[PDB]
C-alpha cells in the first residue's frame, strides 16, 4: 500500500485499494497552514508560488469532482453506469484487461476517444435517468 503503491500492479489491485490515491489528492502536510507563527512583507517570491499552487490544487480537484456530480456518482468512489460498452473501443475480453494491463497502460489505450466516452456518460446516467422520474415520480 501507500500513495500510488499499486501504480505498477495489475488493474485488479488498484481496484482493491484506490482510496490512498483519492485521499492524498486535495490536502497536504506540505501546505502546513502557511504562516511563520512561532521585516514585515509577505510579497516574497515564495508566497506567490505557494498561493498559485494552492489554487490549482482545488482548481484541479473541483474540475474533476464536478465531473463526478454530473454523472450521479458524487457520493461514492466507484459507481456503475447505464452506458453500454462499445466494441470499437477495445476488442479485448473481460478477464483479459483487468489482469494484464495495469491502468498506466490503460489510460494510453483510451486517451484517443476518452472525451467521447465522457460525453455519452452525462447522457445515459443523468440526462435520461434523472429525467425518468417524470413518469415514476408520481402517477
Amino acid at each position, epitope marked *: 500500500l501507500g500513495f500510488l503503491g499499486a501504480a505498477g500492479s*495489475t488493474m485488479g489491485a488498484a481496484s482493491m485499494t484506490l482510496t490512498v490515491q483519492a485521499r492524498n489528492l486535495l490536502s497536504g502536510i506540505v501546505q502546513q497552514q502557511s504562516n511563520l507563527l512561532r521585516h514585515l512583507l509577505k510579497l516574497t517570491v515564495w508566497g506567490i508560488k505557494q498561493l498559485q499552487a494552492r489554487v490549482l490544487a482545488v482548481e484541479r480537484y473541483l474540475r474533476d469532482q464536478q465531473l463526478l456530480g454530473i454523472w450521479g456518482c458524487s457520493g461514492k468512489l466507484i459507481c456503475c453506469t447505464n452506458v453500454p460498452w462499445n466494441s470499437s473501443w477495445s476488442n479485448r475480453n473481460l478477464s483479459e484487461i483487468w*489482469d*494484464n494491463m495495469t491502468w498506466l*497502460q490503460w489510460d494510453k489505450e483510451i486517451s484517443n476517444y476518452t472525451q467521447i466516452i465522457y460525453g455519452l456518460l452525462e447522457e445515459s446516467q443523468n440526462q435520461q435517468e434523472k429525467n425518468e422520474q417524470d413518469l415514476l415520480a408520481l402517477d
Partner: nanobody
Amino acid sequence: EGQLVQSGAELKKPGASVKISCKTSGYRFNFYHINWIRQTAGRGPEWMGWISPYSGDKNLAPAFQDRVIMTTDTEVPVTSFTSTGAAYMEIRNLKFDDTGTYFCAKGLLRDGSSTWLPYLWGQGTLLTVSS
C-alpha cells in the same frame, strides 16, 4: 506480442548435459512466468517447470525436480512497458528417451487464477541425444 526466440541446435553425447537459452523481447519480462515443455519421439508432451522472474519461486515437476535446475537473470528495460530478457535451463544425465523438440513459452497472464500455462511459444530447439 513479442517473439520469444529460442537459441538451440545444441546436442551432445548421452549424459554430457547442456544448457538451453531463450531470448525474449516485446513484453515486460519481469512478471510473466516462463515455462518449459518438450515433445519426445514417443509423443506425450511433458511440462518441465515454471519459474517467475520476480521473487524467484519455482515449482518443477516431481519427475524432473531432482535432475533439472533452471535459473534466470534480470532484464534491461526498453520502454515503460517492454523489455528484453533471457531464460536458461540446466539438465543432468540423459538418454535417447530425452531426445526431441523443446519449447520455451511465455506464461499467459499476470493474475492468480491461471498463469502457469504458456501463451506465446518459442521457435523450438531440436535436441539429438544420439550416440
